[PDB]
Amino acid sequence: LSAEDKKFLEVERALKEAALNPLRHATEELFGDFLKMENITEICYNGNKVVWVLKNNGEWQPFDVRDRKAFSLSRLMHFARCCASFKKKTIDNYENPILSSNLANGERVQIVLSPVTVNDETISISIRIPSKTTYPHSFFEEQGFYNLLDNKEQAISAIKDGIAIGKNVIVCGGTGSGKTTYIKSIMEFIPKEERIISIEDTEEIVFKHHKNYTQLFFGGNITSADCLKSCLRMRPDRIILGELRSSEAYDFYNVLCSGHKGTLTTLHAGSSEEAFIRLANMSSSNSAARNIKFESLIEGFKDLIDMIVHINHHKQCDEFYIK
Amino acid sequence: LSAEDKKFLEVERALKEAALNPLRHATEELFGDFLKMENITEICYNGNKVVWVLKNNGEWQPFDVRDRKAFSLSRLMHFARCCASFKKKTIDNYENPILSSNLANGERVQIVLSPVTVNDETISISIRIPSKTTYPHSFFEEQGFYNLLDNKEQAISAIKDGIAIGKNVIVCGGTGSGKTTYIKSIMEFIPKEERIISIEDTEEIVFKHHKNYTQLFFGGNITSADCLKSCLRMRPDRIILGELRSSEAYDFYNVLCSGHKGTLTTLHAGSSEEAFIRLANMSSSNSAARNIKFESLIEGFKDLIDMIVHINHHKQCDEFYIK
Amino acid sequence: LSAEDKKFLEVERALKEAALNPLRHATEELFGDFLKMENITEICYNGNKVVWVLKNNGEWQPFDVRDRKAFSLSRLMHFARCCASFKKKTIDNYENPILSSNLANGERVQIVLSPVTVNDETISISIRIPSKTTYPHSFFEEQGFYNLLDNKEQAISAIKDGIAIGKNVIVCGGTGSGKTTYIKSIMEFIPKEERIISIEDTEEIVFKHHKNYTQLFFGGNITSADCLKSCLRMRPDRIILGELRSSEAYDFYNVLCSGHKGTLTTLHAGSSEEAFIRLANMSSSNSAARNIKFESLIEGFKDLIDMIVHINHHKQCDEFYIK
Amino acid sequence: LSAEDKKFLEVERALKEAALNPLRHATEELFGDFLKMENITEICYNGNKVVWVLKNNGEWQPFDVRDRKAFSLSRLMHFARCCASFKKKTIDNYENPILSSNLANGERVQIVLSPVTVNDETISISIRIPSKTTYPHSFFEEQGFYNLLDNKEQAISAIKDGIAIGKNVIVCGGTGSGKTTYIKSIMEFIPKEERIISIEDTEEIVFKHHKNYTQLFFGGNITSADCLKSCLRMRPDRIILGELRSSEAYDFYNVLCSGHKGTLTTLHAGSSEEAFIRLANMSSSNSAARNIKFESLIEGFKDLIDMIVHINHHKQCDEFYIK
Amino acid sequence: LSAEDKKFLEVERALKEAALNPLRHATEELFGDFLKMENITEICYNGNKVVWVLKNNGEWQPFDVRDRKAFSLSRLMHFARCCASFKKKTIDNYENPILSSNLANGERVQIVLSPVTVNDETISISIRIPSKTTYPHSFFEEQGFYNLLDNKEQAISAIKDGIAIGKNVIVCGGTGSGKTTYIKSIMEFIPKEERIISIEDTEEIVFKHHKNYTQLFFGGNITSADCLKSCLRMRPDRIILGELRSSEAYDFYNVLCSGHKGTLTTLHAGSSEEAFIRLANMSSSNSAARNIKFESLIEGFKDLIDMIVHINHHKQCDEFYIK
Amino acid sequence: LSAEDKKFLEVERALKEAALNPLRHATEELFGDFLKMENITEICYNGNKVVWVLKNNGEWQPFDVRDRKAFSLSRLMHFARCCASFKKKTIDNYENPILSSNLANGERVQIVLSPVTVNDETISISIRIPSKTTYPHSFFEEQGFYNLLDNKEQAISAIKDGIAIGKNVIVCGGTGSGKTTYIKSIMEFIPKEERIISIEDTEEIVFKHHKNYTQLFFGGNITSADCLKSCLRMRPDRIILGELRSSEAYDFYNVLCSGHKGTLTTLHAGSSEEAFIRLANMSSSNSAARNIKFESLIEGFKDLIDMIVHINHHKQCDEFYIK
């Protein structure tokens, strides 16, 4: 079939692989070395001939690029447009100076040009490194992910059993607190017979223990609400939400109202109590929740969310909400 | 008359059976074997050369299709387009990657293409088997559909008598908990003299004990609200709502406000208390309920819904709400 | 004048009588026999070669039409279009499968075609028989319309005197509970010197005891709100509302706020308490009531409605609300 | 100046007196006799060869016109169109069957044509006689306008003094309760030095005791809100509102909020308490009051309206609200 | 520079001075004599050959103009159009019968034509005389502006000191209660070093004691909200609002929320308590205050407004609100 | 690279330096001398041949320019247009008399022309001097910035430690109270390893102690909400908001809800308590907060804002809110 399938794809690939090849070389030429460094969480460039790299250990390391052709306005701009076209977008110095796109491999890329930047020789770039690895849950314990908890044993058992029985779990914290990583590891506890549908922004979750599943990705005209709506039409046993933004916000509250099996998602929030308000706020912004009391949404999630895990800047659990 | 009627239909049938014949062969060529398997509730394909079939016993069974022409991008895409055109829709890799359509027989079909799927060799397909069969209510008892209830005898009598007297009943639970099946069986108790109008999404309910009736189907530009609106203009004794979504939501609250005879419908909800909120939420989203207090809607259904039956993942009643 | 008036009308009549003659024959050809049967409340056809007729005694009687040219897709469709054009509408298998129109004499007609019906050989038709007769109020007593009441004498006097003094009365119940019939009879008690304006959907009320009056009919672009608005500009002593739908809903609350003489209308509602909420709900849907508290509307009608009469499925009063 | 002014007006008058002369003859030809009858409050025609005339004594008197050319469809329609064009409007059997216009002298006219009327030989007409006369206030007392009050002397003094000091008074009751008449008479008490601006729908108020004043009339594109807005820019001492409808409703609440001198207007309402709600309801419908608590409006008028006079169907005061 | 500046202005002046010269002569020809009369607050013409002039002493004086060419429809109309064009507007007998414009010197002018007036020989005109004089504050005391107060000394000191320290003061009352005049006089107490920006409708305030300042005028497409928005970008020490209308209403509440130095403005209101509600009402009408509780606005101004001065029809303070 | 980068920029620079060179000379010709004066906070021109300059010591100093070509309508207008085009805007005497732009160096400029100004020889100009200097925090103490506090030592330690630990701080006060200056100095306490993103209106903050950072500027079509949205996608450790206006208002409440590290921004407000309401008001105006209770927002910031510093007109802290 590979022979018949190749000719069939031939036309779309040429199309895609015409904006993707260019982008790969730009990517290679500029951030190549950087993308190969182990244990890094973000590659920033501040349009000042210096590349700042953030390590998993929360340290910022700078690198001198004053002497590289790759970091020339012409070279940087070409890279920028390559990202734009790749995601069917435009970046310029007028109506589109700020950009959000991805690399060939899918890593989030945020580019900012003049006039939004201080001057015309400034081109801000921020690459988000998904930290491609799937550490086992045991590894989290061995490293004391739960050491700050007073209910350590309880928490470690609740996460194992809870998830195994299909409770709705929410993992929250700040950008880069290892939220995704954590959920990826705790998935070892979903019975391998479960069908799982994952809705993400960029491929990140890996299915090491499950065969039956499907991954959905929102982006462009396809909102996350579309993927979660499709999801509910694909007979899922577990639904894994890459991250609650605002669109799905309310359509997630509903999925929960209909008493749905095992949900699991990440959210930016400083705490448990916060997570509930974060949810209400978000859900409220939806036109469908235009006639529902605000406190009524908060109490809504309060009944539906079985357990919340918060993670601090030190990639350690500092609160384990239950029941 | 059949002779005159044939020539009369001739032109629409040619039109329809021009998108339906193509679709039948595609359907036959790919999921034929699968659609013939007994006691299955869903046929999923995850674009990975393996067909996953869900059995009534809640088990997932996979099937190797690596060696079939039918499962080639070209073969799969043709099938996909066949579903699209059949329901007057389009499926593509741009503005219409997600699709909701039906088979020749009416079974719900959910197709997802790239870019929404992980890659371009992935084509997600989910067929919903309306488990074709009409088991007698007695069969439900023999199998202990009510065994978890503490008010078993009470419940089994309430459902028989209640329905016979025209109470408004709501059957709820998760996808595939046998809600439809249950309502089809409990219909044995509606006096055969009753005129029944059924509003569904796909033909599913069967009228084994009733002669005078009519089936309405919403889809496309015809919303369910249109069918329920027409319904109230067709002198019905009993109204059977395939499933409360959101459109009818409020227009259902009203049908109840006007003190209407015997209503009976299914709804996704984890419990009794939940069902009332599920209802309010939904009704609220309607512009007509823009000036009605939210708690006022909840109390609204609370007075109008005489009895609620909830079903767990094990296709067993685990709560029988009454009065 | 009849001579000059004839030539004057000549042009509109030809126009109307060009869609009305066709419709009369279709009507005659199909439901002729049926429309001549005494004491029937609805003529239904379920696209199955059988005509179901509902008798005043709540019984459904079926009739075999397998052997009639009139009931051929071609014959049924022609009838359907005749109804459509008659009311300046279209009925088809695409954007207009559901239809609401009337017969030459004005009886409500609801037609449903494929795709909304189960198949293409199904054409649903529901004719509503106004039950053309004006029984005296005494006849209602002789038949025990009030026998279920504990306050029988009280109720029978309240309706007589109340109406005679101009109180606002609301008659409610389900479709075909003899609401219209009832109001028609209790009109014997409005002083014959009263000027009455009636706003209906189809001519039904008869003025046996009153000379000075005028009938308004809404339909098409003319909403009932338009007729009630005109009404208040025609110096009426009594206003008879065919039936509260939703448009007039709020503009009716107002007519009452301005302390208006004798109002009398029908409404679908299961009870007294219900009728008040039914009213609030409806009024609320109006943009003019966008800034008025929902409970404030309920209390609104509670002060204004002097007496409510409810009728059960057995065409008997089972609640007589007063003061 | 009359010579120069004539040539100046010549062009508009020709324009106006081209639709007004035709209308005068029609008016003369049909309702001539009727318009000359003394003490009548409304001339109704129900499209049945009979003209119904309402006398000031609340009696309905009918007149046989079967034998008059004037009452022929052709003759009636010409009259109808004459009213339409006169007010720059259209009346027809399609998009404009209902009409609201005026006669040459300004009397309100309500015409209804088929399809809104029962048949095509029916043409409903309702003329409102502004009972042309300005009876002295003393005459009201002599006739016992206040005889039903327990606080007779109090009330009669309050109305005299109150109005003389500039209190905000509201006269309310049903159509034809002599509200306008009453206000016209109580104007004898406004110091003759007061500048008065009157906002009406049709000229009706007469200034027997005042020289400095101006009359504003709303109609067509000029809403009453425009006339009250202009009013507040014409240095008025007293403002007389023909009748509170809904536009001015809120813009009237404001005029009062700014603590304005002497206001006086009529409103349809059954009582005092009702009048306040009638006001709130109306004010609320204005976009400017979109963010104001409903009960807050009621309390608003409650502080601002110093005294309310209600009149029953018998043209007698049956409630005199004060302070 | 005057030489270079003249040529530069030459083109705009010709443009303006082409609609302004015509208007001056019309103004001169008609209301000349009248505009020269001392101590008058308004010049009204009621289209009846009589000019009514209001004196500062609250007296209305009429003047016979039957024998003047100036008061001929042709002469009056020309004047009317002159005002219209001057402010870039149109006045006619159709879509623009009501007019608001100004004279060459800026005095407010309100013109009303037929159909809004009673007949075609009626042309209503109302000129508002700013009363061009700047009496000292002491003069107010000598005349007993504060004599009705029980806290006389207190009030007279509070106004002096308060204003000197930059408190937010609101002067309110009815049209022509000498509000503007009052504020103009109390400005003697703002330290001469203060920079003041004044936002008015027409030039009226005079800066007798201040050198550093700027005057803003709203009108036409430039709303007062625009001038107050610009104001906050011109480093003002004191802001003087000609008069709170509704646009600035909320944008004024905000200026106060940001704890702004010395504000001072006039508002139409009957009292202190009223002034706060007047403010809330107005602010609420702004889209920006769409999500803020109504009582929350009232309490808003209650904290921010340090002192309110009300003036009665007798140009005397009858309430001095403080703290 | 400078060689390749030059040719690359060549085309945009020519474009920009074509509106910027003209503007520099105008700026030089008129306000040159003035812009060179030390310790000044605003340069105002009131279209009266006198330039008013505000000194840091709160004193207003005027300067005679009657004898300068630069201050001639032609000379002033050319300057004005130069500012307009520079920011891609238009300034005229019709639809764009008010202008907000910047100088070559970025200083805020507010220009007002006739008709908005009193006459045609008036051209209002207000330049805001960003007092260019970065005084050390110690300098603030030496000058008694905290001397009015009863909790002096506490406050001075709280600001040092608080900021060092990443608390959310809000600095508020009136225009020119040295808010920006203060925040610039207290930045010495953010660990030099912290990545900082600053969102301003004009470049003002200076990074004396930090290497890794990026500056974002909103203006034109790029709102501040866009820069804060981009900000959260650039892995910041600290976010410095030039000033809360209204757009970011709610999108700032959210950034805080997600428990974000170290925020620090300025806001116009008279006090602590005020600052919370100022925040709520602003956030509410956002469509996303349309369904959130107003008091719920106030309580929102109350939990999230760790410490608020208010500054009086005398550039001294007069309230130090904490916890």
Coordinates of C-alpha atoms in Angstrom, one line a residue, chain F residues 27-266:
Chain F
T27 CA 11.4 69.9 17.5
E28 CA 14.8 71.6 17.6
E29 CA 13.5 74.9 16.2
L30 CA 10.6 75.3 18.7
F31 CA 11.3 73.5 22.0
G32 CA 15.0 73.0 21.7
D33 CA 16.1 75.3 24.5
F34 CA 13.3 74.0 26.7
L35 CA 14.1 70.3 26.2
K36 CA 17.6 71.0 27.4
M37 CA 16.6 72.5 30.7
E38 CA 17.4 70.3 33.7
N39 CA 14.8 68.9 36.2
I40 CA 11.6 69.6 34.3
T41 CA 8.6 67.3 34.1
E42 CA 6.5 68.9 31.3
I43 CA 6.7 71.6 28.6
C44 CA 3.4 73.2 27.9
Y45 CA 2.4 75.7 25.3
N46 CA -1.0 77.3 25.5
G47 CA -1.0 79.0 22.1
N48 CA -0.4 82.4 23.7
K49 CA 3.2 83.2 22.8
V50 CA 4.3 81.8 26.2
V51 CA 5.9 78.5 27.0
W52 CA 5.2 77.1 30.5
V53 CA 7.7 74.7 31.9
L54 CA 7.0 72.6 35.0
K55 CA 10.0 71.9 37.3
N56 CA 10.5 68.8 39.4
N57 CA 10.0 71.1 42.4
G58 CA 6.3 71.4 41.3
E59 CA 6.9 75.0 40.1
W60 CA 5.5 76.5 36.9
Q61 CA 7.9 78.8 35.0
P62 CA 6.8 80.8 31.9
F63 CA 8.9 81.9 29.0
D64 CA 8.3 84.7 26.5
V65 CA 8.4 83.6 22.8
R66 CA 6.6 86.5 21.2
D67 CA 9.7 87.2 19.1
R68 CA 10.4 83.8 17.6
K69 CA 9.7 82.6 14.0
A70 CA 9.3 79.1 15.4
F71 CA 6.1 80.1 17.2
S72 CA 4.1 81.2 14.1
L73 CA 0.9 79.4 13.1
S74 CA 2.7 78.2 10.0
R75 CA 5.7 77.0 12.1
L76 CA 3.6 75.5 14.8
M77 CA 1.3 73.6 12.3
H78 CA 4.2 72.2 10.4
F79 CA 5.5 70.8 13.7
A80 CA 2.1 69.4 14.5
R81 CA 1.8 67.6 11.2
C82 CA 5.4 66.4 11.7
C83 CA 4.2 64.6 14.9
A84 CA 1.1 63.2 13.2
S85 CA 2.8 61.6 10.3
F86 CA 5.6 60.4 12.5
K87 CA 3.1 58.1 14.4
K88 CA 1.1 57.5 11.2
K89 CA -1.8 59.9 12.1
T90 CA -3.4 63.1 10.9
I91 CA -4.0 66.4 12.7
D92 CA -6.4 69.0 11.2
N93 CA -9.2 71.5 12.0
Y94 CA -11.9 69.0 11.2
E95 CA -12.0 65.3 12.0
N96 CA -8.6 65.2 13.8
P97 CA -8.0 68.3 15.9
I98 CA -6.7 66.4 19.0
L99 CA -3.5 64.5 18.7
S100 CA -1.4 62.2 20.8
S101 CA 2.1 61.4 19.3
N102 CA 5.7 61.4 20.3
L103 CA 8.9 63.2 19.6
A104 CA 12.0 61.7 17.9
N105 CA 13.2 60.5 21.3
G106 CA 9.8 59.1 22.3
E107 CA 8.4 61.8 24.7
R108 CA 4.7 61.9 24.8
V109 CA 3.1 64.8 22.9
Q110 CA -0.5 66.1 23.2
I111 CA -1.6 68.7 20.5
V112 CA -4.9 70.4 20.3
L113 CA -6.0 72.6 17.4
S114 CA -9.1 74.7 16.5
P115 CA -12.0 74.2 16.6
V116 CA -11.4 72.3 19.9
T117 CA -9.3 75.3 21.2
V118 CA -10.8 78.7 21.9
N119 CA -9.8 80.2 18.6
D120 CA -7.8 79.7 15.3
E121 CA -4.6 81.3 16.7
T122 CA -4.5 78.8 19.5
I123 CA -2.5 75.7 19.3
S124 CA -2.1 73.7 22.5
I125 CA 1.0 71.6 23.1
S126 CA 2.0 69.4 26.1
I127 CA 5.2 67.6 26.2
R128 CA 5.9 65.0 28.9
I129 CA 9.5 64.8 30.0
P130 CA 10.2 61.3 31.2
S131 CA 12.7 62.8 33.6
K132 CA 15.7 61.0 32.3
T133 CA 17.8 59.6 35.2
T134 CA 18.0 56.4 37.3
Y135 CA 18.6 57.3 40.9
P136 CA 19.6 54.5 43.3
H137 CA 17.0 53.3 45.8
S138 CA 19.2 54.5 48.7
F139 CA 18.9 58.0 47.3
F140 CA 15.1 57.7 47.9
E141 CA 15.7 56.9 51.6
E142 CA 18.3 59.6 51.9
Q143 CA 15.6 62.0 50.6
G144 CA 12.9 60.6 52.9
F145 CA 10.7 59.0 50.4
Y146 CA 9.5 56.9 53.3
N147 CA 9.6 59.5 56.1
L148 CA 5.9 59.9 56.4
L149 CA 5.4 56.2 57.2
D150 CA 4.9 55.0 60.8
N151 CA 6.2 51.7 59.6
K152 CA 9.3 53.2 58.0
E153 CA 11.9 50.4 58.6
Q154 CA 9.2 47.8 57.9
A155 CA 8.3 49.3 54.6
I156 CA 11.9 49.8 53.5
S157 CA 12.6 46.2 54.2
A158 CA 9.4 44.9 52.7
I159 CA 10.1 46.6 49.4
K160 CA 13.7 45.3 49.4
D161 CA 12.9 41.7 50.4
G162 CA 9.4 41.5 48.9
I163 CA 10.7 42.4 45.4
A164 CA 13.7 40.1 45.9
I165 CA 11.3 37.2 46.5
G166 CA 9.0 38.0 43.6
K167 CA 5.9 39.5 45.1
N168 CA 3.4 41.4 43.0
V169 CA 3.8 45.1 43.7
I170 CA 1.8 48.0 42.5
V171 CA 3.0 51.6 42.6
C172 CA 0.4 54.2 42.3
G173 CA -0.2 57.9 42.5
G174 CA -0.9 60.9 40.3
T175 CA 0.8 62.0 37.1
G176 CA 4.4 62.9 37.9
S177 CA 4.6 61.6 41.4
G178 CA 7.8 59.7 40.4
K179 CA 6.1 56.3 40.1
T180 CA 8.3 55.2 37.1
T181 CA 11.4 56.6 38.8
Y182 CA 10.6 54.7 41.9
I183 CA 10.1 51.3 40.2
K184 CA 13.3 51.9 38.1
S185 CA 15.2 52.2 41.4
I186 CA 13.6 49.3 43.3
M187 CA 14.6 47.0 40.4
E188 CA 18.1 46.8 42.0
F189 CA 16.6 44.1 44.2
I190 CA 15.5 41.6 41.5
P191 CA 18.2 38.9 41.4
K192 CA 20.4 39.7 38.3
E193 CA 19.7 36.2 37.0
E194 CA 16.1 37.0 36.5
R195 CA 14.8 37.4 33.0
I196 CA 12.6 40.5 32.7
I197 CA 10.2 41.6 30.1
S198 CA 9.0 45.1 30.2
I199 CA 5.8 46.4 28.6
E200 CA 5.8 50.1 28.1
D201 CA 4.3 52.9 26.2
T202 CA 7.6 54.7 25.5
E203 CA 11.1 53.5 26.4
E204 CA 11.7 54.6 30.0
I205 CA 12.9 51.8 32.2
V206 CA 16.6 51.1 32.1
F207 CA 18.2 47.8 32.8
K208 CA 21.3 48.7 34.9
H209 CA 21.6 45.4 36.7
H210 CA 20.2 42.9 34.3
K211 CA 21.5 41.4 31.1
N212 CA 18.8 38.9 30.1
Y213 CA 15.7 40.8 29.2
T214 CA 13.4 42.2 26.5
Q215 CA 11.3 45.3 26.0
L216 CA 7.9 45.4 24.4
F217 CA 6.1 48.5 23.4
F218 CA 2.5 48.9 22.5
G219 CA 1.1 51.6 20.2
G220 CA -1.0 51.9 17.1
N221 CA -2.7 48.6 16.3
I222 CA -0.6 46.8 18.9
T223 CA -2.4 47.1 22.2
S224 CA -0.8 46.6 25.5
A225 CA -2.9 43.4 25.8
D226 CA -1.0 42.0 22.8
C227 CA 2.4 42.7 24.4
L228 CA 1.3 41.1 27.7
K229 CA 0.0 38.2 25.8
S230 CA 3.3 37.8 23.9
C231 CA 5.1 38.4 27.2
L232 CA 3.5 35.3 28.7
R233 CA 5.0 33.4 25.7
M234 CA 8.6 34.6 26.3
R235 CA 9.5 32.7 29.5
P236 CA 9.8 35.8 31.8
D237 CA 10.8 35.6 35.5
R238 CA 9.6 39.1 36.2
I239 CA 7.0 41.2 34.2
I240 CA 7.2 45.0 34.4
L241 CA 4.0 46.8 33.3
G242 CA 4.7 50.3 32.2
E243 CA 1.2 51.3 33.4
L244 CA -2.3 49.6 33.8
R245 CA -4.7 51.3 31.4
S246 CA -7.8 49.1 30.8
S247 CA -7.0 46.7 28.0
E248 CA -4.5 44.7 30.0
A249 CA -6.6 45.4 33.1
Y250 CA -8.4 42.0 33.0
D251 CA -5.6 40.1 31.2
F252 CA -3.5 41.2 34.1
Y253 CA -6.0 39.8 36.7
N254 CA -5.6 36.5 34.9
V255 CA -1.8 36.6 34.8
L256 CA -2.1 36.9 38.6
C257 CA -4.8 34.1 38.9
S258 CA -2.4 31.7 37.3
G259 CA -0.1 32.5 40.3
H260 CA 2.6 34.3 38.4
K261 CA 6.0 35.0 39.9
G262 CA 7.0 38.7 40.1
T263 CA 4.8 41.3 38.7
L264 CA 5.3 45.0 39.2
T265 CA 3.3 47.9 37.7
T266 CA 2.2 51.5 38.1

